[PDB]
RNA sequence: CAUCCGGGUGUUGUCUCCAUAUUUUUU
């Protein structure tokens, strides 16, 4: 995996981002919009739960992720 | 103002899905949204965390409980971003 | 009076971190937000008896951050005063 | 902004925020119970409104308990930042 | 229409049989009568009683309970 | 010879907002709103419509250099040889386009520009029968005259919400040369005269009902929009709306303290004069008569407006128009006011009940629409229809009943229709027609192919069962407001 | 400041989902900005009523469902 | 008239018993002072683990967020 | 600054130079600022007059262009009431006369002008309530201090050059411009607006006929 | 249907003058 040594989150917007969630799932997709409260809008969001064995996988598309239920953000891949 | 909350209120009317902290998904026409995501739906299917589906006419939700909201592919186009 | 001043003044330091679940995080303090959001480059994770999961970049949510283990060469009283 | 910090330090000295502020002034080791069960013996350096507190001379005490094998575990850290919400009860050891 | 502030002002003057449920808590209930009211939802309750749930009358007195962990009230 | 019209489909204007996303918002019936722009003769409603047209499209091909510079108004929706030579809208025209409010939520609006001369009131009766709400445009010099009085009495009669646009605000400044306090008293006189004919409802500029506009200089604003641009980045954000409710009607301000008495020391003006109207007079005076070197520095510092190096070399009226379009940006305050005026739940049922014999409901399966007028639009003739219920598809045979039959057929339903196939469906846009495949509930379209089935108006229905034939109810014929009495 | 528009649901029975899978039936009496539901008490989840008039805290609300149309 | 905050101001310099939510325990010590946040401080606070004094903690400072109820 | 070069092709002035040329050229200005002056003297009324063969009372007279000249309009059956004099046949030319051939339709109206001039003594301000005008008869909340409206740092509403700006703003063609290009010397028609307006006073017969002959030349 | 006095804009050349925290987010 490769990414630029970025200063802040908004500078790397529209990047394929692995986004953890407090309930155990991880949402992977290119981020369109962020917030002061860390609400995120993934362009091609993909629902990936970790069941109690192997990864659960599901496609969502354009979705809002609420900020409170986020654990953290990670860059998965580049734009385009 | 919150640009994701901007998107939510712009998404009113479409068949949107919604899972909470509880893990119980929903899916139907949205009706109302605010700064705190005080969501309302119509024609909402209410699948419990086990998978027990219960069709119902309406629902109101509090924003603290909301986890994520499935928006359609129309809001990808216009006009909130640029 | 704000420790946010101090945490803002903590920059480009390689630090360990704990979370609400208790996950470790070894990475350079790229920046810290006024609400504790630890922006970190060149990071390494290890879960709570579990094996390694190293990564390229992680900005972690402020509330999820439990306890940041600071580095060795650190004058606390130097940064505390304006 | 300045008047709020004036009444902050004023309300600390008179209110119960004076205790661990006085513990920082006396600079003693203090035990602190935690949300995920960690009795933190450490030297308090920093102190704010939210009870976030940088700790020198750190010594966390806990029990990683799994497998019917009580393994009371503990570690020393040079310096560590504490988040407020984790704290339950701070106390100055006599 | 009755906002919660006005309905609790009825509970303040009346002091009628209140039953309280608790936040992040199913194992225990309370039974008393409302006596105080804050600008937050903090309310002091005299004649309060700890009442474990119907899955008995256990001892409890007058309590200032931190009101940010309230669920039910009914005077 | 007859119209100016865009026949080549490749030469369509190029629509900044991606029309496919506009058509996708027609699925939600609450996203569409039908507004007709009525008012008196030579008050500004066509130029008001032309502002929205200019800001909605990328490159209009009929726009010359003079209508860009601002000498002659582009009268885009006038469109005819009659309306160019006579200088007078004689037929209603429209445009369907999407617009965003101040909270960035975009919605599809069907504007029907209507004539203002008093002989053409058949047209205005069509526009009142079509529109969900109307925005009555009046000019500030004449006041609410007897024509305005009748237009608002007919807006009340038709169960139609309404909105007001005070127009020609420059004529207070440049023509009549009124001082700012006297112009404030003029505006308060017009608004207090508006509220005398409206039965009970309250029209004030702070309830998003009153909209101040020029349309020759090419601006419009509201108090909410004008606070939202330049004031409310300084107010603490919990106070903003409350400050806007302080912006009208004899509340006075000095130094952070609001009160009602004339404050006895500073001899200031009321708050609308000081915060909104005197800065508007200053924009006009300084655009026309200040040296440009001081003006670009002052204007960059106050409004963050950056005057380009081309736009210093103008004539005074294009420069005033350029400055006023850069201070007052696109017409989002008017669209926000339109969104804050119309509630569908209150008035759609009463409007269909007033047009056609109040029943309980219509079934959601049946197609039920209202053919308002035959309009010669672009060479051939199109029906102009509003869809009240159901869906309509291109290639569908429906029953078109003339409205003169309907008052008998309704009693016979309380106690056959010729069918036609829908050849084409188009969205009206001004100098052109945009072809669309299907037409949903709640929107106004042009339908080619049913025009031979009726005289002045008709009703269009497609029933699925036989049982829904007793459920459906037919439209009553129009009240063309003036009786035709002049004979030849 | 944004008032949750419960005037559509005012004086109607509502199935309030609250913390720990608990339900509350009851006709609505009023509310505030925090969503604290002032409601006439009804049967709580076979089924049994506690109280006559109730005030539920907003933080404890999971949801509130339209029982009455 | 007997509100929480004025009774709490009367409860200053008096014995109090603190109960909490998760991983929690009753207490018993003389309240020192309070604020609008309801941060507590006790002297001679005995750690009553479900009404069983596990240890005399003494001079202590309790956080506001984890407070459930406070009694005599 | 005020010209492109010695090729002498384009010009651009300031406001006081343009205002000075506006005052200084008083005897040859148009001095008609509303378009409702030319109600039945516009170009298109002249074309309808030539085509219909009528004569509006102060304009030109041409040949018919249709010089070859039933009981529908009989006397017994038409109601004689409000005579159909020639201004009505010019103004509404498809209604008042049968067979309108080669007739065009002449711009109904312009709304009503209420421009107010200010020429007396100059010491009256720019914004002033004229004697022509009718009259118009009949602390919980605070903000931060030093909250002032937008242009409060510039305290003068009326600049000194603004009366000249509001007078040049309404002048007809050459003076509302302050930017343009050089034309030829004979292409500037100085007598032309004179015979397009009306006769200024009551003149001899020769001088009223001279207006008509020149004005006929303009129409052709 | 033509002739004549004139005009715009674009590309190239040429000429002249100078220059190189206390309920929905985070306590
Ligand atoms: N002086 C001045 N004139 C204006 C202003 N706004 C519009 N007009 C003029 O008003 C005249 C009428 O404009 P339109 O909008 O075309 O007329 P209308 O409102 O459609 O009325 P109709 O005759 O029915 O079309 C135009 O010649 C404009 O020049 C203004 O703000 N000031
Ligand atoms: Mg018009």
DSSP labels, C50-81? --EEE-SEEEEPTTTEEEEE--SS--HHHHH-
How many C-beta atoms surround the C-beta of residue F87 within 10 A? 16
The angstrom resolution of this structure is 3.3
CA distance F168 to F187: 12
Backbone angles phi, psi at F278, to 5 degrees: -65, -40
Contact between residue F194 and residue F211 where contact means Cβ atoms under 8 Å apart: no
State the distance from the centre of ligand 1 to the C-alpha of F114, rounded, in angstroms: 13
Identify the experimental approach: cryo-EM
Contact assignment for E64 to H2 by CB distance below 8 Å = no
CA distance F293 to I14: 13
Contact between residue I90 and residue I54 where contact means Cβ atoms under 8 Å apart: yes
Helix (H) or strand (E) holding F150: helix F146-157
Output Rg (C-alpha) for chain F, integer angstroms.
Answer: 24
Helix (H) or strand (E) holding F369: strand F367-376
State the distance from the centre of ligand 1 to the C-alpha of F78, rounded, in angstroms: 12
Q: Which of G53, G18, G50, G52 is nearest to G35 (CA)?
A: G18
Four-point Cα dihedral I25, I28, I31, I32, nearest 10: -150
Best mutation target among H60, H68, H70 (most D Cβ atoms within 10 Å) is: H60
What distance in Å separates residue D58's CA from the closest CA in chain H? 19
- How many domains does chain A fold into? 1
Any residues with CB less than 8 A from the CB of I184 and at least 6 apart, and which?
none
Q: Which of F450, F459, F403 is nearest to F425 (CA)?
A: F450
Strand F106-113 and strand D29-34: pairing?
Answer: unpaired
CA distance H31 to H18: 10
Any residues with CB less than 8 A from the CB of F165 and at least 6 apart, and which?
F48, F135, F136, F137, F138, F210, F211, F212, F213, F220, F334
Determine the 3-state secondary structure of F182 from DSSP. Answer: helix
CA distance A7 to A10: 9
What letter would DSSP give residue G27? B
**E51, β-bridge pairs:** E29
How many C-beta atoms surround the C-beta of residue D9 within 10 A? 12
Hey, what CATH topology would domain H1-72 get? Answer: SH3 type barrels. (2.30.30)
Q: Which of I54, I65, I111 is nearest to I88 (CA)?
A: I54
What letter would DSSP give residue A79? -
The answer to whether B63 CB is within 7 Å of strand J is: yes
Contact between residue I38 and residue I109 where contact means Cβ atoms under 8 Å apart: no
| A22 CB-side CA count, 13 A | 20
Query: Mapped to the 3 state alphabet, what secondary structure does E25-73 carry?
Result: CCCEEEEEEECCCCCCCCEEEECCCEEECCCCCECCCCEEECHHHECCC
| Ion ligand 2 nearby residues (CB, 5 A) | F 46, 89
How many C-beta atoms surround the C-beta of residue I38 within 10 A? 17
Contact between residue E49 and residue E38 where contact means Cβ atoms under 8 Å apart: no
Determine the 3-state secondary structure of F371 from DSSP. Answer: strand
Backbone angles phi, psi at F320, to 5 degrees: -65, -40
CA distance C5 to G8: 47
For F291 and J20, how far is CA from C1' in angstroms?
37
CA distance C71 to D58: 13
Q: Which of C5, C38, C7 is nearest to C23 (CA)?
A: C38
B73 neighbourhood in chain F, CB within 8 Å = none
Determine the 3-state secondary structure of F469 from DSSP. Answer: helix
CA distance D29 to D37: 18
Cα F20 from chain centre = 22
Q: Which residues, judged by CB distance below 6 Å to any ligand atom, belong to the binding site of ligand 1?
A: F 41-47, 73, 75, 88-89, 115-117, 168, 170-171, 214-216
Q: Which of G34, G35, G37 is nearest to G54 (CA)?
A: G37
The DSSP secondary structure of F308-338, one letter per residue, reads -SSTTSS-HHHHHHHHHHHHS-SSHHHHHHH
Helix (H) or strand (E) holding F134: strand F133-139
The answer to whether H23 CB is within 7 Å of strand J is: no
Q: What is the CATH number of the domain that holds G41?
A: 2.30.30.100
Contact between residue A8 and residue C39 where contact means Cβ atoms under 8 Å apart: yes
Q: Which of A7, A77, A8 is nearest to A42 (CA)?
A: A77
| C28 CB-side CA count, 13 A | 9
Contact between residue H10 and residue H24 where contact means Cβ atoms under 8 Å apart: no
Question: For residue F304, what are the CA distances in angstroms to A77, F288, F307, F323?
Answer: 38, 19, 10, 12
CA distance A39 to A43: 13
Q: Which of G31, G32, G53 is nearest to G42 (CA)?
A: G53
The answer to whether C5 CB is within 7 Å of strand J is: no
CA distance F190 to F379: 42
The DSSP secondary structure of chain I, one letter per residue, reads --BS-TT--EEE--HHHHHHHHHHTGGG------TTS-SSSSHHHHHHHHHHT---TTS-----SS-----SS-TTTS---S---HHHHHHSTTTSSS---S-----------------STTTS-SS---TTSPP------B--SS---TTTTS--SS-TTHHHHHHHTT--STTS-SEEE---STT--SSTTHHHH--SS---HHHHHHHHHHHHHHH-
What letter would DSSP give residue F274? I
Q: Which of A80, A60, I114 is nearest to F141 (CA)?
A: I114
Any residues with CB less than 8 A from the CB of F346 and at least 6 apart, and which?
none
Question: For residue F280, what are the CA distances in angstroms to F210, F256, F260, F361?
Answer: 17, 22, 23, 50
How many C-beta atoms surround the C-beta of residue A54 within 10 A? 6
The answer to whether G59 CB is within 7 Å of strand J is: yes
Cα F475 from chain centre = 25
CA distance H38 to F228: 39
Residue F395 annotated in ligand binding: no
Contact between residue D87 and residue D45 where contact means Cβ atoms under 8 Å apart: no
Cα I61 from chain centre = 24
Chain breaks in chain D (C to N over 2.5 A) after: none
The DSSP secondary structure of G31-60, one letter per residue, reads --TT--EEEE--EE---EE--SEEEE-STT
| I165 CB-side CA count, 13 A | 26
Question: For residue E14, what are the CA distances in angstroms to B33, E9, E48, F227, F330?
Answer: 37, 8, 15, 47, 57
**B40, β-bridge pairs:** B32, B60
CA distance D41 to D60: 6
Any residues with CB less than 8 A from the CB of E23 and at least 6 apart, and which?
E68, E69, E70, E71, G19, G57, G59, G60, H21
User: Does residue B79 have a cis peptide bond before it, meaning omega lies within 30 degrees of 0?
Assistant: yes
Q: Which nucleotides on chain J have any atom < 7 A from a protein Cβ?
A: 6, 8, 21-27
Please list the helix, strand and coil fractions of chain H in percent, rounded to the nearest 5, in that order.
10, 45, 40
Any residues with CB less than 8 A from the CB of D89 and at least 6 apart, and which?
D32, D33, H57, H60, H61, H62, H63
Question: Considering only CA atoms, which residue is closest to atom 25 of ligand 1?
Answer: F89
Question: For residue F231, what are the CA distances in angstroms to F224, F247, F276?
Answer: 10, 12, 10
Contact assignment for F18 to B77 by CB distance below 8 Å = yes
**C27, β-bridge pairs:** C15
| F196 CB-side CA count, 13 A | 13
Question: For residue I14, what are the CA distances in angstroms to F367, F455, I118, I164?
Answer: 65, 62, 22, 12
What distance in Å separates residue E1's CA from the closest CA in chain H? 25
Query: Mapped to the 3 state alphabet, what secondary structure does F386-443 carry?
Result: EEEECCEECCCEEEEEECCCHHHHHHHHHCCCCEEECCEEEEECCCCEEECCEECCCC
Backbone angles phi, psi at G36, to 5 degrees: -70, 115
Contact between residue F211 and residue F164 where contact means Cβ atoms under 8 Å apart: yes
Contact between residue F76 and residue F430 where contact means Cβ atoms under 8 Å apart: yes
Contact between residue H44 and residue D94 where contact means Cβ atoms under 8 Å apart: no
CA distance E45 to E20: 10
CA distance F240 to F246: 10
Question: For residue H54, what are the CA distances in angstroms to D36, D60, H29, H40?
Answer: 19, 20, 14, 20
* B1-82: CATH architecture: Roll (2.30)
Output Rg (C-alpha) for chain G, integer angstroms.
Answer: 11
Q: Which of F186, F204, F182 is nearest to F143 (CA)?
A: F186
Cα H23 from chain centre = 16
Contact assignment for F86 to I107 by CB distance below 8 Å = yes
CA distance F33 to F341: 11
The beta strand positions in D5-92, using DSSP E, are 29-34, 39-44, 53-63, 72-82, 87-92
Q: Where are the domains of chain D?
A: 1-94
Question: For residue F277, what are the CA distances in angstroms to F230, F270, F327, F397?
Answer: 14, 10, 14, 57
Segments forming the whole domain that contains residue E67 = 1-75
The answer to whether D50 CB is within 7 Å of strand J is: yes
Question: For residue E69, what are the CA distances in angstroms to D2, F15, G19, H21?
Answer: 33, 55, 12, 9
Helix (H) or strand (E) holding B26: strand B25-32
State the distance from the centre of ligand 2 to the C-alpha of H8, rounded, in angstroms: 72
Chains A and B touch (3+ CB pairs under 8 A): yes
Query: Mapped to the 3 state alphabet, what secondary structure does A1-51 carry?
Result: CCCCCCCCCHHHCCCEEEEEECCCCEEEEEEEECCCCCCEEEEEEEEECCC
Contact between residue F287 and residue F275 where contact means Cβ atoms under 8 Å apart: no
Chains with 3 or more CB pairs closer than 8 angstroms to B?
Answer: A, F, G
Backbone angles phi, psi at B76, to 5 degrees: -55, -35
Q: Helix count (H) and strand count (E) of chain G?
A: 0, 8
Determine the 3-state secondary structure of D43 from DSSP. Answer: strand
CA distance F368 to F153: 28
Cα F447 from chain centre = 23
Contact between residue D35 and residue D86 where contact means Cβ atoms under 8 Å apart: yes
Contact between residue I180 and residue F310 where contact means Cβ atoms under 8 Å apart: no
Q: Which of I162, I1, A26 is nearest to F295 (CA)?
A: I162
Residue F365 annotated in ligand binding: no
How many C-beta atoms surround the C-beta of residue E1 within 10 A? 12
**A28, β-bridge pairs:** A18, A46
Chains I and A touch (3+ CB pairs under 8 A): no
Task: Count how many residues are written for chain E.
Answer: 75
Question: Could you give the angle at the alpha carbon of D27 between the alpha carbons of D22 and D29, nearest 5°?
Answer: 105
Task: Determine the straight-line distance between the first and last CA of chain C, rounded to whole angstroms.
Answer: 11
Q: Where are the domains of chain B?
A: 1-82
Contact between residue F33 and residue F109 where contact means Cβ atoms under 8 Å apart: yes
Q: Which of I172, I208, I220, I161 is nearest to I38 (CA)?
A: I172
Cα E62 from chain centre = 11
- How many domains does chain G fold into? 1
Contact between residue G12 and residue G28 where contact means Cβ atoms under 8 Å apart: yes
Determine the 3-state secondary structure of H17 from DSSP. Answer: strand
Q: Which of I115, H69, I204 is nearest to E66 (CA)?
A: H69
Residue F170 annotated in ligand binding: yes
CA distance H28 to H31: 9
- Evaluate whether the domain defined by D1-94 bears CATH number 3.50.50.60: no
Residue F218 annotated in ligand binding: no
**G27, β-bridge pairs:** G13
């Amino acid at each position: 995996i490769q990414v630029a040594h970025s200063s802040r989150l908004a500078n790397l917007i529209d990047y394929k981002l692995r986004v953890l969630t407090q309930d155990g799932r991880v949402y992977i997709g290119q981020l369109m919009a962020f917030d002061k409260h860390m609400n995120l809008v993934l362009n091609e969001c993909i629902e990936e739960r970790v069941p109690k064995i192997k990864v659960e996988k599901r496609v969502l598309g354009l979705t809002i992720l609420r900020g409170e239920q986020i654990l953290s953000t990670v860059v998965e891949d580049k734009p385009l | 103002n919150g640009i994701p909350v901007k998107l939510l209120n712009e998404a009113q009317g479409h068949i949107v899905s919604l899972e909470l902290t509880t893990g119980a998904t929903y899916r139907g026409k949205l009706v109302e949204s605010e700064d705190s995501m005080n969501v309302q739906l119509r024609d909402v299917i209410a699948t419990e965390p086990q998978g027990a589906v219960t069709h119902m006419d309406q629902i109101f939700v509090r924003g603290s409980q909301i986890k994520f909201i499935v928006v359609p592919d129309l809001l990808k186009n216009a006009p909130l971003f640029k | 009076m704000k420790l946010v001043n101090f945490l803002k003044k903590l920059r480009n330091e390689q630090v360990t971190i704990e979370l609400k679940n208790g996950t470790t995080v070894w990475g350079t303090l790229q920046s810290v937000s006024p609400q504790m959001n630890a922006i970190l480059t060149d990071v390494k994770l290890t879960l709570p008896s579990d094996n390694i999961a190293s990564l390229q970049y992680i900005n972690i949510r402020g509330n999820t951050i439990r306890q940041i283990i600071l580095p060795d060469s650190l004058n606390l009283d130097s940064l505390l005063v304006d | 902004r300045a008047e709020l910090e004036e009444l902050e330090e004023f309300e600390f000295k008179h209110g119960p925020m004076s205790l661990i502020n006085d513990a920082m002034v006396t600079r003693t080791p203090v035990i602190i119970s935690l949300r995920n069960n960690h009795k933190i013996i450490a030297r308090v350096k920093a102190f704010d409104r939210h009870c976030n507190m940088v700790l020198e001379n750190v010594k966390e005490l806990w029990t990683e308990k799994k497998g019917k094998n009580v393994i009371n575990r503990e570690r020393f850290i040079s310096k560590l930042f504490l988040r407020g919400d984790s704290v339950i009860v701070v106390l100055k050891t006599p | 229409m009755v906002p919660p502030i006005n309905c609790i002002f009825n509970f303040l003057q009346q002091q009628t049989p209140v039953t309280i449920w608790l936040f992040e808590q199913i194992g225990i209930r309370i039974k008393g009568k409302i006596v105080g009211f804050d600008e937050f939802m903090n309310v002091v309750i005299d004649e309060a009683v700890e009442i474990p749930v119907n899955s008995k009358g256990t001892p409890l007195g007058k309590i200032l309970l931190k009101g940010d962990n309230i669920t039910l009230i009914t005077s | 010879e007859h119209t100016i019209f865009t026949q080549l489909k490749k030469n369509i204007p190029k629509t900044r907002y991606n029309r496919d996303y506009m058509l996708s918002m027609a699925n939600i019936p609450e996203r569409i709103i039908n507004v007709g722009v009525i008012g008196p003769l030579h008050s500004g409603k066509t130029s008001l419509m032309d502002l929205l047209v200019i800001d909605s499209h990328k490159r209009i091909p009929d726009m010359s250099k003079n209508v860009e510079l601002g000498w002659k108004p582009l009268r885009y929706l006038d469109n005819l040889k009659q309306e160019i030579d006579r200088g007078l809208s004689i037929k209603l025209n429209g445009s369907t386009l999407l617009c965003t409010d101040l909270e960035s939520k975009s919605r599809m609006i069907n504007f029907l520009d209507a004539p203002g001369h008093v002989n053409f009131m058949d047209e205005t009766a069509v526009a009142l029968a079509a529109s969900d709400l109307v925005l009555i445009v009046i000019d500030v010099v004449e006041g609410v005259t007897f024509v305005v009085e009748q237009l608002i009495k007919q807006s009340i009669k038709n169960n139609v919400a309404m909105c007001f646009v005070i127009n020609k605000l420059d004529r207070l400044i440049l023509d009549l040369k009124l001082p700012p306090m006297d112009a404030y008293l003029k505006l308060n006189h017009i608004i207090a005269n508006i509220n005398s004919f409206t039965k009970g409802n309250v029209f004030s500029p702070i309830d998003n009902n009153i909209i101040f506009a020029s349309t020759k200089l090419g601006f419009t604003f509201t108090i909410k929009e004008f606070v939202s641009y330049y004031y409310a980045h300084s107010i603490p954000s919990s106070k903003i709306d409350d400050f806007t409710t302080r912006l009208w009607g004899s509340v006075y301000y000095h130094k952070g303290n609001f009160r009602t008495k004339p404050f006895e020391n500073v001899e200031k003006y009321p708050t609308f004069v000081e915060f909104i109207l005197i800065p508007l007079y200053k924009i006009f005076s300084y655009a026309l008569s200040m040296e440009k070197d001081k003006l670009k520095n002052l204007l960059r510092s106050n409004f963050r407006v950056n005057l380009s190096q081309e736009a210093l070399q103008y004539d005074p009226q294009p420069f005033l128009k350029h400055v006023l379009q850069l201070i007052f940006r696109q017409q989002t305050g008017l669209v926000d006011a339109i969104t804050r005026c119309y509630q569908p739940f209150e008035l759609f049922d009463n409007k269909t009940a007033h047009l056609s014999i109040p029943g309980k409901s219509t079934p959601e399966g049946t197609l039920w629409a209202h053919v308002l007028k035959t309009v010669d639009y672009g060479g051939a003739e199109w029906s102009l229809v509003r869809i009240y219920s159901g869906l309509l598809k291109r290639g569908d045979t429906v029953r078109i009943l003339d409205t003169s039959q309907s008052e008998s057929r309704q009693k016979r339903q309380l106690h056959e229709t010729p069918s036609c196939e829908v050849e084409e469906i188009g969205l009206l846009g001004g100098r052109y027609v945009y072809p669309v495949h299907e037409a949903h509930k709640g929107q106004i379209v042009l339908i080619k192919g049913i025009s031979s089935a009726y005289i002045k108006s008709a009703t269009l229905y497609s029933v699925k069962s036989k049982e829904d034939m007793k459920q459906l109810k037919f439209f009553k014929p129009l009240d063309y407001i003036t009786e035709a009495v002049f004979k030849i | 400041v944004s008032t949750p528009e419960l005037k559509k649901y005012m004086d109607k029975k509502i199935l309030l989902n609250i913390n720990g899978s608990r339900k509350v039936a009851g006709i609505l009496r009023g509310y505030d900005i925090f969503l604290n539901v002032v409601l006439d008490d009804a049967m709580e989840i076979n089924n049994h009523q506690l109280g006559l008039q109730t005030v539920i805290r907003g933080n404890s609300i999971i949801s509130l469902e339209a029982l009455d149309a | 008239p007997v509100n929480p905050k004025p009774f709490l101001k009367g409860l200053v310099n008096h014995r109090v018993g603190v109960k909490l939510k998760f991983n929690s325990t009753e207490y018993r010590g003389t309240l020192v002072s309070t604020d609008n946040y309801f941060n507590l401080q006790l002297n001679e606070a005995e750690e009553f683990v479900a009404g069983v004094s596990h240890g005399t903690l003494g001079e202590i400072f309790i956080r506001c967020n984890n407070v459930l109820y406070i009694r005599e | 600054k005020k010209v492109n070069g010695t090729s002498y092709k384009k010009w651009s002035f300031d406001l006081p130079e343009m205002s000075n040329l506006y005052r200084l050229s008083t005897p040859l200005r148009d001095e008609v600022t509303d378009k409702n002056y030319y109600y039945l003297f516009d170009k298109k009324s002249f074309f309808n007059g030539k085509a219909l063969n009528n004569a509006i009372p102060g304009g030109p007279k041409f040949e018919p262009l249709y010089p070859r000249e039933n009981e529908f309009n009989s006397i017994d059956r038409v109601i004689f009431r409000v005579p159909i004099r020639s201004e009505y046949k010019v103004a509404f030319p498809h209604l008042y006369n049968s067979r309108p051939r080669s007739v065009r339709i002449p711009w109904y109206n312009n709304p009503v002008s209420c421009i107010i001039q200010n020429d007396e003594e100059y010491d009256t301000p720019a914004l002033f309530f004229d004697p022509s005008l009718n009259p118009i008869p009949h602390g919980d909340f605070t903000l931060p201090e030093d909250f002032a409206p937008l242009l409060a740092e510039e305290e003068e509403l009326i600049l000194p050059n603004t009366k000249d700006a509001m007078s040049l703003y309404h002048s007809p063609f050459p003076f509302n411009r302050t930017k343009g290009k050089m034309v030829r010397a004979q292409d500037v028609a100085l007598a032309k607006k004179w015979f397009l307006q009306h006769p200024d006073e009551e003149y001899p017969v020769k001088v009223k006929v001279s207006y008509q002959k020149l004005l006929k030349n303009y129409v052709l």
